[PDB]
Amino acid sequence: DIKAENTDANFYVCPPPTGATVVQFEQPRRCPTRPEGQNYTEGIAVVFKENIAPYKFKATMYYKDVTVSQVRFGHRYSQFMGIFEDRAPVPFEEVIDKINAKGVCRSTAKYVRNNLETTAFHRDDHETDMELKPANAATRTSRGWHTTDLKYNPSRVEAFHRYGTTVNCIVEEVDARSVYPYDEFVLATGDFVYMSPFYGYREGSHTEHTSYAADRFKQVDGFYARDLTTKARATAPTTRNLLTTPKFTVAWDWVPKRPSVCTMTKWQEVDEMLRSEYGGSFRFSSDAISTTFTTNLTEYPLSRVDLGDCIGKDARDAMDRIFARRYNATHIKVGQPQYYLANGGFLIAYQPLLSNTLAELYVREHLREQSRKPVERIKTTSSIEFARLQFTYNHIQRHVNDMLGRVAIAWCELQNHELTLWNEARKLNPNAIASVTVGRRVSARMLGDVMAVSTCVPVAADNVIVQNSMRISSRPGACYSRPLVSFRYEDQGPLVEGQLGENNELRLTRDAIEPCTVGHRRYFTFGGGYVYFEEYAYSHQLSRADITTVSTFIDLNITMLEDHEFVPLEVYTRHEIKDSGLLDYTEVQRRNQLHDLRFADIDTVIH
Amino acid sequence: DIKAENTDANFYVCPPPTGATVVQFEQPRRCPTRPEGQNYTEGIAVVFKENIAPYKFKATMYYKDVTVSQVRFGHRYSQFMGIFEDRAPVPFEEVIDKINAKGVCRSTAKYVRNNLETTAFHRDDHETDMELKPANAATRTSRGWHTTDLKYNPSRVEAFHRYGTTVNCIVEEVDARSVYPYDEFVLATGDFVYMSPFYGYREGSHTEHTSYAADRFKQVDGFYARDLTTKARATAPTTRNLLTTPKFTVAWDWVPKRPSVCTMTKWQEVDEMLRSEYGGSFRFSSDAISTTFTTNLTEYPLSRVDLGDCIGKDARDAMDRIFARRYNATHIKVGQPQYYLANGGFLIAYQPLLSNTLAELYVREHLREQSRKPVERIKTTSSIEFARLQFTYNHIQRHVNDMLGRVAIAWCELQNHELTLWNEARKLNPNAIASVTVGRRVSARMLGDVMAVSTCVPVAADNVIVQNSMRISSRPGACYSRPLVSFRYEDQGPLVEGQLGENNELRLTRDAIEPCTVGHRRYFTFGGGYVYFEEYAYSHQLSRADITTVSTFIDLNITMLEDHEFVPLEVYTRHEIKDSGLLDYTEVQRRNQLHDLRFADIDTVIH
Amino acid sequence: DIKAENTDANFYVCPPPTGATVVQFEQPRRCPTRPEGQNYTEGIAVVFKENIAPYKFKATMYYKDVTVSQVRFGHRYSQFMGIFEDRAPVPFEEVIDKINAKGVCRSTAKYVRNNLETTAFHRDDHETDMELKPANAATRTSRGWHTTDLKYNPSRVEAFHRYGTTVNCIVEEVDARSVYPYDEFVLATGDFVYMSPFYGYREGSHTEHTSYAADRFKQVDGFYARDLTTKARATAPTTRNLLTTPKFTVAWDWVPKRPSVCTMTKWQEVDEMLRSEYGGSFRFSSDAISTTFTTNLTEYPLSRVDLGDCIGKDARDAMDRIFARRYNATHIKVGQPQYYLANGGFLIAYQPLLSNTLAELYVREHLREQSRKPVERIKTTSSIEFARLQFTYNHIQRHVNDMLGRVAIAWCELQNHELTLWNEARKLNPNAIASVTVGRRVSARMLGDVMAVSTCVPVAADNVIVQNSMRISSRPGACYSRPLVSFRYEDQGPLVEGQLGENNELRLTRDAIEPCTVGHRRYFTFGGGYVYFEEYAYSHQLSRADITTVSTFIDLNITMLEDHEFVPLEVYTRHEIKDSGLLDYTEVQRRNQLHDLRFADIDTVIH
Ligand SMILES: *[C@@H]1O[C@H](CO)[C@@H](O)[C@H](O)[C@H]1NC(C)=O
Ligand SMILES: *[C@@H]1O[C@H](CO)[C@@H](O)[C@H](O)[C@H]1NC(C)=O
Ligand SMILES: *[C@@H]1O[C@H](CO)[C@@H](O)[C@H](O)[C@H]1NC(C)=O
Ligand SMILES: OC[C@@H](O)[C@@H](O)CO
Ligand SMILES: OC[C@@H](O)[C@@H](O)CO
Ligand SMILES: OC[C@@H](O)[C@@H](O)CO
Ligand SMILES: OC[C@@H](O)[C@@H](O)CO
Ligand SMILES: OC[C@@H](O)[C@@H](O)CO
Ligand SMILES: OC[C@@H](O)[C@@H](O)CO
């Protein structure tokens, strides 16, 4: 009669474990260990980049503006028939004697042009010396001086003098620049000077390049300049270089090549650069700038660079400087500065430090820092993102490896310990612990130290009926603790006798009995729900919902890291920068060289 | 006789816990809490960058091409002895009266050159006015017009006229550009005009810079232009500026400085910029562009910028625009736009939003958004990678901190709860729970609420023999549940009597007995394996391998994040860009100024 | 009398669970599954970028330097009154007949200038042919040749010859460059040639642009050049282009447009580019370069590009090359190369591979790789950081999602399994398991398969006294196992009788008794500590500290990922690059065009 109302469940006939099949629990696994901690060397670091700025220096030009006009007069009007313009060099001798000495220039110009020695007379008059005045003030320009402010033109009546010669002697202070390898240079005027800024006579200067004839170049020793405005002469003297070109004479103070140019530029000072050896490479990290560089395990000889004699000295100045402001107390140096070549073409100067705390290895370390110890130009990349990605990935990589490492270690330690809990629980309830461990409904029992298991058998719910009395009629005072049941293995078969174990297990022997008692209330797992009993008499049925639920579970909500799309982004596009410069040479040239195609006629022949 | 076959194990004699040493389990620890959730302000944002484009405007040049040729004739041939070329300005008056009015130019040119007032006659003939025609079509150029298409040269017979003057009046529409601070400017021709585009007479224009004499500049009020092709005059008038230079007269419509130039440029519009205050700085995040900026907690006054009056207005236009298309319904604004200065030199306009949902704080928030509330130019960096690294690290940082936080919280909660399981397991098996907790083989027993522990003693395996009967001969019906054993503490010593506890513990008192029974099968942990018994009679030995193994362990395979190396990578190297421009000025100059060293002789004097 | 010394605790009177309230444990939850594993296609890849380099080619210029000087002599001096300089084209005919054939030039120059046909005579003497010599050696320049090295000037006595004409015929080998769309081009001299490099007569060359008159251009078929130094003529012939401009004639070998220019440039070869379809886009990853690109699911037709016929062929050459060196053995290709357009404007050529191992799908896959299968110019971004961020985030994203996924899965599996432990522990100690699960001090007991719970009641410590005898006087031989106690529910109330359960639970019925015994030592949780008993006689009190503590906890120390700030960092700032070029055009122009404002007088009129 009484069948389960919660049809939606399963019953299991669990054979007495014959003893034929025996299993053992797996015993505590070897658990991993926290990885060996990587050692970091503390240090001061200076990072260098390829130098891309020109060598820059001061020069002074000496030339005269020569103009020869050809004039012609009509009735109440005059026209230029021509205007000759040229630039002429001031001779060495006039620069020293006249100008530098007295601040004066000759009113005539005499130089070589088109293979001729030529002479021009201001106003076509007799030669004098003229005083030099500042050029009219102009915004953002270096200093200039000139003698003449007007262009001389012949008057209408001078019928034997239809040409008019002007001379304006000009001195200018100009910036000069020279690209590596400093074989020639330019002035601020746009004029190329095809001689090394480092060319000269003394100390292997005569090595450097010159495209000129020897007499175009003078090197004046013990030279004292004389400001042309203050009229004051310098306190110390220089080695004054002068080169006369066809259009100007240019002076400059001679200084040595190697102490003046360097192929590398200091880019970053880093207080704490962390050095950690691994992978056959060193790695250098700076959290200050969030950058990580990677060099070979061997030092890079500073002697291997061309014109790299700013590096050695640039490193130390800043280091000593930093070490003072940060380490002189808590720390000391270790060994003499080292140099390594990072990918990206960076050059790192590194000063190993040491806290007095670990002073015990001073003697130890002082050796190691000398094992990596020991011509070309280094191309540095424009983008540092790689070393910054490297830094970021690394920092994030190590962190999760560590905390997930630690997690994993605990998990194992926790499996090992809970076994002990299962070892006691097996004995209390072998069928359930077996069923769960083994991973299928089984019947089990201890055979000493191992467990026997037999595989259960399913029975339906329409194939399962319940008896409404747990009271043993013949033996009053004695009662079934749980309920009795009848069932059929298949939907239509002999109905069997047994009692309801836990978890809908159908137990064959009705052998589980207690001494009866009063108040008897019970709830017995029955199908998808519970069956209820008062005083060993079947009362009614229920569903799990009909009972409040509490949990034996510890909570944990993990959510995944969302997908994210990184779109291209640039502060200024390649064209914005192409459009930032005021004048564009290509554009101007193109336009200019359209003048005659646009406005005139380049093909027609008249005659 | 019977010694263990699995020699590879250890036995422990466990003293009865004297009671001398008592321990307690540690009780539930205080478990951490999920960090206080950081609040995000929703907003619309506009980000600005340093402006690096020139101020660009339209101008018109007026000048005439003047050519004076000098010719000479041989028998059946003629040669140029010279060609004078010059550019002359069109006077103010001719520009207005002749050109703008009628589209005509005078055929003569009269201007000042080299301190002379000079006059040129097309064909050296009498003055007329000539019509202006478009310049011959050219690809990609602005508009031009000219009067003359041929160069006038004197014919062979004209023996009293060996010079030939040409005049070609030219008007061009050209682009003009001016860099900050807009004190001078350039034309598309390459010509510098050394006067502010904003120079003029009205409203403090006369403030701006001019390098010219006053009469070179005219400001024509109520000016109506007349297209020189359509012949149509403009519908409205302008304030027309004209400056006569020595080589051309240049006009342009006068417009005010402050409403025409801005030192900042809008770069990004962001619908949702998230504002979260922390660390004494704000942070602004955009997932749309994956960028995170960092500003001080105080607003940056828009009045603090020079010529920054595009910013205020540029912000609002887009915002109102965005707020409409996205927030007018679900949201409202909060307070008046604010401005902050990010590192990298970015300027963020931010419009705080609010969902009608949280409208309850409208009154609250409306105050907070006014606490940070209130000359120089801002340099913006070219690289945004920092703010994008920042964004990425932050998003990844917060996520693991959170899920590992949650993990940690559960772990603790799980240790606290399982204790309760150990508290029941201690009572069932004190030696084992003690041994594991304590972390060494001990003997234990409850002394009420605390546990007593004594440290066990090791015994070898050759020092351990087993008895092959668990049947008590004298007391049939009574039997040992486990096996009896004999052993010696040291390899050669008095053989002791006791029985085999669990886990190879050697128990001294042979006191563990049961009522005998039938079918008796048992397996007892013996050395590295098990000892087997049927009916209280020793049968044989086994190894763990000889028994199938199931596991009481939950699985978890963590693998570490692999090491990864980020190599330098650039879309175009610094040289590729240096090689992208069609013409290179430095290169051309260098080459050109080699012409005479290469092809001619600059030193030889003839005479 | 005896009250607890550790006042700092709580006692609970736990009502016998009336049975009124029943709960059930929650049963095993459904646990999540490891996400479906994403499939990666192995491949070879070639990535292309917008081409930004000019089309570069070789040309040869032919022109003559013509100089006409005007001289004048004073007593012991001479002055240049003028110097006419011009460049004249070499006619087509002289280039072929004289130069190319014999390495000679005519000593006269005849070309059109200013609408006149003009003729110049070296030394004003009769015409000859002159031999061509190399230009004087110059560092880093292409080849040149000239006929004349001196400038001819008339001597002092030649009173009927005051002008002096020089001619220097010049040939140069120059680089020429042309920007897209290759309509005009430039020479190394700075000269614009306003004709397509691809202009010509044959095969639709006459399509291309020319700004010149037809007779300025010749196309010489079957042309054999003759080195002007080695005097050796080429082994094969070319289609020689010649264009005469007003200032020079320029030759070059004609080659077809489409096979000579390409709008795209190969940037990267990638051995393993991993292709994984998701989100309606493909993704392409390279660990070699740590870059991830994102394209639409459909192929991008190579026929869609303008002048993109370098791409098809450039792809295969490298691929076949790579496939050989890496895949020909372990792998094979799959389908014909495909092309996709990534964001950032990158173009990826991809060759799908396949290990012989999975050869079983060769037939399957061979179809799929053909489903995405099929004019403008592509702008590529300068910054690749996005695709590298993308790559890094993705790799880090997937990893934590995976290991935290796996973690979560275990956690659940572990909650499910431990329930079974709680199911056995409930029966051993219902009050404690109830109290913990339920989450408040309760009293509990099994009612079959569910648990009854009643909520306990707090009692103070001053409200709790202890009896110093556990020995039952009237029933010697029988003794309380734990202690007896008296207490009051409120500070001043009837003192109640009961005994001390565990965990400071006050049990009402003094029903827990044992048979007395000897040695009796006990410790009973009492307040914040323990109460101690020897032989059922109260001895003294203690604190937890007074007892050593061991732990039932597995350890786990998680630390959070630190906050990190990424500061802007650039290898070279925008100005450093602006300052890297030797000569600056804008600067030079500005300065130059200050010459007269600085040094002369542009306003004063004399007469
Ligand atoms: C390291 O050494 C190898 C060969 O020894 C060389 O090819 C490589 O360029 C070096 N790299 C660096 C970072 O110095
Ligand atoms: C923030 O304030 C400090 C001093 O108050 C200043 O030095 C710093 O430049 C400011 N930074 C920003 C991002 O405005
Ligand atoms: C993908 O397709 C959409 C429309 O179909 C188009 O707007 C978008 O530009 C395409 N993106 C790529 C990466 O090709
Ligand atoms: O006047 C001496 C000075 O010019 C030194 O440089 C020489 O070595
Ligand atoms: O060819 C140069 C010409 O275009 C300029 O002088 C116009 O101003
Ligand atoms: O014609 C009037 C117009 O030029 C205004 O700009 C004057 O303010
Ligand atoms: O000095 C200028 C010269 O090199 C060019 O005119 C050659 O074309
Ligand atoms: O001499 C033949 C050669 O110039 C070929 O290019 C013609 O197609
Ligand atoms: O205007 C050109 C002038 O500044 C230079 O020639 C000076 O060298």
Q: What is the 3-state secondary structure (H, E, C) of C40-90?
A: CECEEEEEEEECCCCEEEEEEEEEEEEEEEEEEEECCEEEEEEEEEEEEEC
Using an 8 Å Cβ cutoff, are C505 and C14 in contact? yes
In single-letter form, the type of residue at position B225 comes to: A
Same domain, A224 and A255: yes
Taking CB atoms and an 8 Å cutoff, what residues of chain A touch C594? 138, 141
Q: Which ligand is nearest to the CA of C174?
A: 7
Decide whether any atom of ligand 7 lies within 6 Å of the B592 Cβ: yes
The helix/strand/coil state of B32 is coil
Protein residue whose Cα sits closest to atom 8 of ligand 9: A189
How many Å apart are CA B244 and CA B524, to the nearest integer?
Answer: 117
Q: To test the ligand 8 pocket, which listed residue (C221, C223, C254) has its Cβ within 8 A of the most ligand atoms?
A: C221
Closest CA to B444 of B463, B425, B417, B416: B425
Phi, psi of B415 (to 5 degrees): -70, -45
The helix/strand/coil state of C15 is coil
Structure tokens at A38: 């990587």
Using an 8 Å Cβ cutoff, are A194 and B594 in contact? yes
Residue A360 neighbours by CB under 8 Å, 6+ apart: none
Gyration radius (Cα) of chain C, Å:
50
How many Å apart are CA A258 and CA A309, to the nearest integer?
Answer: 7
How many Å apart are CA C498 and CA C14, to the nearest integer?
Answer: 12
By CA distance, what is C558's nearest residue in A?
A403
How many Å apart are CA A316 and CA C312, to the nearest integer?
Answer: 55
Structure tokens at A373: 């110890």
After what residue numbers is chain C broken, C–N > 2.5 angstroms? Answer: 374
Pick the last residue of a domain from C209, C238, C259.
C259
Distances (CA, A) of C539 to C1, C478, C492: 14, 20, 27
Structure tokens at B464: 């351990």
Using an 8 Å Cβ cutoff, are C428 and C498 in contact? no
Structure tokens at A249: 């004479």
How many Å apart are CA A34 and CA C557, to the nearest integer?
Answer: 12
Residue B309 neighbours by CB under 8 Å, 6+ apart: B258, B259, B262
CB contact B402 to C (< 8 Å): no
Distances (CA, A) of C123 to B81, B431, C81, C472: 14, 124, 18, 149
Using an 8 Å Cβ cutoff, are B593 and C190 in contact? no
Structure tokens at C7: 């006042």
Pick the last residue of a domain from C259, C283, C306.
C259
DSSP string, A165-196: EEEEEEEEEEEEEE-TT-SSEEETTS-EE-B-
How many Å apart are CA B341 and CA B381, to the nearest integer?
Answer: 13
Q: In ligand 4, which atom is closest to the CA atom of A221?
A: 4
Pick the last residue of a domain from B223, B238, B259.
B259
How many Å apart are CA B273 and CA B5, to the nearest integer?
Answer: 74
Sign of the torsion angle spanned by Cα atoms A298, A301, A304, A309: positive
Structure tokens at A501: 């174990």
Distances (CA, A) of A438 to A9, A430, B7: 21, 11, 30
How many Å apart are CA A397 and CA A390, to the nearest integer?
Answer: 10
Distances (CA, A) of C398 to A322, B156, C34, C264, C342: 42, 90, 12, 34, 22
Q: In ligand 3, which atom is closest to the CA atom of C281?
A: 13
Chain A, residues 469-528, CB within 8 A of chain B, namely none
How many Å apart are CA A320 and CA A339, to the nearest integer?
Answer: 16
Same domain, B25 and B8: no
Using an 8 Å Cβ cutoff, are A377 and A305 in contact? yes
How many Å apart are CA B91 and CA B245, to the nearest integer?
Answer: 10
Using an 8 Å Cβ cutoff, are C171 and C144 in contact? yes
How many Å apart are CA B199 and CA B205, to the nearest integer?
Answer: 5
Same domain, B216 and B266: no
Q: To test the ligand 4 pocket, which listed residue (A224, A233, A239) has its Cβ within 8 A of the most ligand atoms?
A: A239
Using an 8 Å Cβ cutoff, are A519 and A490 in contact? no
DSSP string, A427-491: HH-HHHHHIIIIIS-EEEEEEBTEEEEEE-EEE-STTEEE-SB-B-SSSTTEEESS-EEEE-SSS
Strands C548-550 and B22-25: parallel
Pinpoint the alpha helices (H) of C522-583. 574-578
How many Å apart are CA C507 and CA B310, to the nearest integer?
Answer: 82
Same domain, C254 and C283: no
Tokens 């990349």 -> residue: A381
Residue A18 neighbours by CB under 8 Å, 6+ apart: A452, A454
Structure tokens at C581: 């070029």
The helix/strand/coil state of A339 is strand
Q: To test the ligand 5 pocket, which listed residue (A583, A589, A595) has its Cβ within 8 A of the most ligand atoms?
A: A595
Say whether C447 and A521 touch across the interface (CB within 8 A): yes
CA B436 to chain centre: 53
Closest CA to C129 of C174, C179, C90, C156: C90
Protein residue whose Cα sits closest to atom 6 of ligand 1: A296
Closest CA to B68 of B154, B170, B157, B169: B154
Distances (CA, A) of A174 to A57, A248, B305, B593: 9, 13, 34, 19
Q: Min CA distance, B372 vs chain A (Å)?
A: 27
Q: Under the phi-then-psi rule, with left for phi > 0, alpha for psi from -120 to 50, and beta for the rest, what region is A108? A: beta
Q: What DSSP state is assigned to residue C123?
A: G
After what residue numbers is chain B broken, C–N > 2.5 angstroms? Answer: 374
CATH number assigned to the domain comprising residue B468: 2.30.30.1230
CATH number assigned to the domain comprising residue A47: 2.30.29.100
Chain B, residues 540-579, CB within 8 A of chain A, namely 544, 547-554, 556, 558, 560-561, 563-570, 572-574, 577
Q: Based on the structure, what is the number of domains in chain C? A: 5
Same domain, A23 and A164: no
Spatial strand order in the sheet of A505-507: A2-3, A464-466, A484-487, A496-500, A505-507, A11-13, A457-459
How many Å apart are CA A102 and CA A10, to the nearest integer?
Answer: 121
Using an 8 Å Cβ cutoff, are A239 and A221 in contact? yes
Same domain, A407 and A439: yes
Residues with CB under 6 A from ligand 6: B 221-222, 237, 239
Residue A494 neighbours by CB under 8 Å, 6+ apart: A488
Same domain, A95 and A21: no
Same domain, A424 and A558: no
Residue C358 neighbours by CB under 8 Å, 6+ apart: none
Strands A457-459 and A11-13: antiparallel
Same domain, C471 and C419: no
Say whether C290 and A135 touch across the interface (CB within 8 A): no
Phi, psi of B157 (to 5 degrees): -80, -25
How many Å apart are CA C170 and CA B218, to the nearest integer?
Answer: 49
First-residue to last-residue Cα distance in chain A: 135
Using an 8 Å Cβ cutoff, are C471 and C495 in contact? no
How many Å apart are CA A365 and CA A385, to the nearest integer?
Answer: 33
Tell me the HSE value of A195 on the side-chain side, using a 13 A CA sphere: 24
CA dihedral angle for residue C390, residue C391, residue C395, residue C397, rounded to 10 degrees: 0
Q: Under the phi-then-psi rule, with left for phi > 0, alpha for psi from -120 to 50, and beta for the rest, what region is A307? A: left
Tokens 């205020």 -> residue: B312
Q: What's the 3-state SS for A188-248? A: CCCCEECECCCCCCCCCCCCCCECCCHHHEEEEEEECCECCCCCCECCCCEEEEEEECCCC
Residue B251 neighbours by CB under 8 Å, 6+ apart: B59, B60, B62, B95, B240, B241, B242
In single-letter form, the type of residue at position B471 comes to: R
* Rounded (5°) CA angle B507-B511-B515: 130
Same domain, B467 and B362: no
Beta strands in B26-76 (DSSP E): 43-50, 55-74
Structure tokens at C66: 């013509």
Burial of A109 (0-12, 13-18, 19+ CB in 10 A): buried
CA dihedral angle for residue B443, residue B445, residue B449, residue B453, rounded to 10 degrees: -20
How many Å apart are CA A182 and CA A210, to the nearest integer?
Answer: 11
Q: Under the phi-then-psi rule, with left for phi > 0, alpha for psi from -120 to 50, and beta for the rest, what region is B439? A: left
Strands B450-455 and B22-25: antiparallel
* Count of beta carbons in the 10 Å neighbourhood of residue C254: 21
Decide whether any atom of ligand 7 lies within 6 Å of the B598 Cβ: no
Range of the domain at C475: 1-16+457-548
Gyration radius (Cα) of chain B, Å:
50
How many Å apart are CA A293 and CA A286, to the nearest integer?
Answer: 9
How many Å apart are CA A543 and CA B231, to the nearest integer?
Answer: 98
- List beta partners, residue A249: A62, A244
How many Å apart are CA B212 and CA C603, to the nearest integer?
Answer: 9
Tokens 């747990």 -> residue: A470
How many Å apart are CA B90 and CA A31, to the nearest integer?
Answer: 95
Same domain, C119 and C221: yes
How many Å apart are CA B508 and CA C31, to the nearest integer?
Answer: 48
Can you give the length of chain A in residues? 607
Closest CA to A325 of A353, A300, A286: A353
In single-letter form, the type of residue at position C50 comes to: E
* Count of beta carbons in the 10 Å neighbourhood of residue A287: 16
Residue A563 neighbours by CB under 8 Å, 6+ apart: C279, C397
Same domain, C268 and C372: yes
First-residue to last-residue Cα distance in chain B: 135
In single-letter form, the type of residue at position B423 comes to: N
How many Å apart are CA C533 and CA C541, to the nearest integer?
Answer: 9
CATH number assigned to the domain comprising residue A561: 6.10.250.3280
Tokens 């100067």 -> residue: A349
CA of A409 to the centre of ligand 3 (A): 48
Q: What's the 3-state SS for C339-388? A: EEEECCCEEEEEEEEEEHHHHHHHHHHHHHCCCCCCCECCCCCCCCHHHH
Residue C521 neighbours by CB under 8 Å, 6+ apart: B19, B447, B448, C532, C533, C534
Closest CA to A450 of C469, B548, C100, B362: B548
CB contact B163 to C (< 8 Å): no
Protein residue whose Cα sits closest to atom 8 of ligand 7: C189
Say whether B449 and C151 touch across the interface (CB within 8 A): no
Structure tokens at A251: 């002076």
The helix/strand/coil state of C189 is coil
